[PDB]
A = this chain, B = another copy of it.
Amino acid sequence: GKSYPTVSADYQKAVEKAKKKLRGFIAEKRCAPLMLRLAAMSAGTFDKGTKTGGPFGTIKHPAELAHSANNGLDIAVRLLEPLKAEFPILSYADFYQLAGVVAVEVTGGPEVPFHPGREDKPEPPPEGRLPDATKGSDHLRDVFGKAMGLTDQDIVALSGGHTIGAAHKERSGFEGPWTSNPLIFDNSYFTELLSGEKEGLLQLPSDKALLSDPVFRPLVDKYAADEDAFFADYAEAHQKLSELGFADA
């Protein structure tokens, strides 16, 4: 149900050049997880009923923010600002979603389709829309399903975004990587989740909730057994997330 806007050839050229620059920058700076989180969090403020929030450039340097546990988003936007300045024609909204797409790609993840044309709108979303790491399956459905409009499949696949990166005690309070290879986009998140707690590795209560739900659990099993299937569902879910409220939502 999407109808993507037309952008100029010059806009399209800037998207391609920015995509390359983002690859090199993100790879060199080792900041893929931070960038994926920035993109996903920006997009995740969308509420379908009111059609407010979503990936529309509302988070930017200097952030903003406020918003806690969390923290780190401020660093991400500052890191990207010099690069963004090289592409004044691009909206911040597009730039940050493209960074998220690139973050998945340069860590070896699937190639998430990207369509340009998001407009930067004046007011940021209200707070309290982000998921709470201490809560469970009902809460996940409230946030990703009732508010964002994503499916149960999307919830499990997107949770696999935790396959890269780590929590920090000075940010959320949780601490450490979900995986033994936290710069490699793979299905290890699901394998580690299944095998229970392991020293050095993190599981949020929100991750564990996937294990006890009769719909989520079989997907966790599927993804743990089949990385190709995880990649396919992940790319579909990330694309939908990145396009919430855009070109029809």
> Across the interface, which residues of B come within 8 angstroms of A126, CB to CB?
126, 128
One digit per residue, 1 when the CB lies within 8 angstroms of any chain B CB and 0 when it does not, for chain A 41-58 equals: 000000000111000000
- 5 sample A-B contacts, Cβ–Cβ < 8 Å, listed by A number: A50-B50, A50-B51, A50-B52, A126-B126, A126-B128
> Across the interface, which residues of B come within 8 angstroms of A50, CB to CB?
50-52
Interface members, chain A 112-158 (any B CB < 8 Å): 126, 128
**In the bound complex, how far is the Cα of B52 from the Cα of A50, in angstroms?**
8
> Across the interface, which residues of B come within 8 angstroms of A52, CB to CB?
50
Chain B nearest Cβ from A112, distance in angstroms:
30
Interface members, chain A 89-112 (any B CB < 8 Å): none
Chain B nearest Cβ from A72, distance in angstroms:
24
> Across the interface, which residues of B come within 8 angstroms of A128, CB to CB?
126
**In the bound complex, how far is the Cα of B127 from the Cα of A126, in angstroms?**
8
**In the bound complex, how far is the Cα of B53 from the Cα of A52, in angstroms?**
14
> Across the interface, which residues of B come within 8 angstroms of A51, CB to CB?
50
**In the bound complex, how far is the Cα of B50 from the Cα of A51, in angstroms?**
8
Closest to A128 in B: B126
**In the bound complex, how far is the Cα of B52 from the Cα of A52, in angstroms?**
11
Chain B nearest Cβ from A148, distance in angstroms:
16
**In the bound complex, how far is the Cα of B49 from the Cα of A51, in angstroms?**
10
Closest to A50 in B: B50
Interface members, chain A 28-52 (any B CB < 8 Å): 50-52
**In the bound complex, how far is the Cα of B52 from the Cα of A186, in angstroms?**
41
**In the bound complex, how far is the Cα of B126 from the Cα of A52, in angstroms?**
12
**In the bound complex, how far is the Cα of B52 from the Cα of A31, in angstroms?**
38
Closest to A125 in B: B126
**In the bound complex, how far is the Cα of B51 from the Cα of A50, in angstroms?**
8
Closest to A51 in B: B50
Closest to A52 in B: B50
Chain B nearest Cβ from A164, distance in angstroms:
32
**In the bound complex, how far is the Cα of B128 from the Cα of A219, in angstroms?**
40
Interface members, chain A 49-101 (any B CB < 8 Å): 50-52
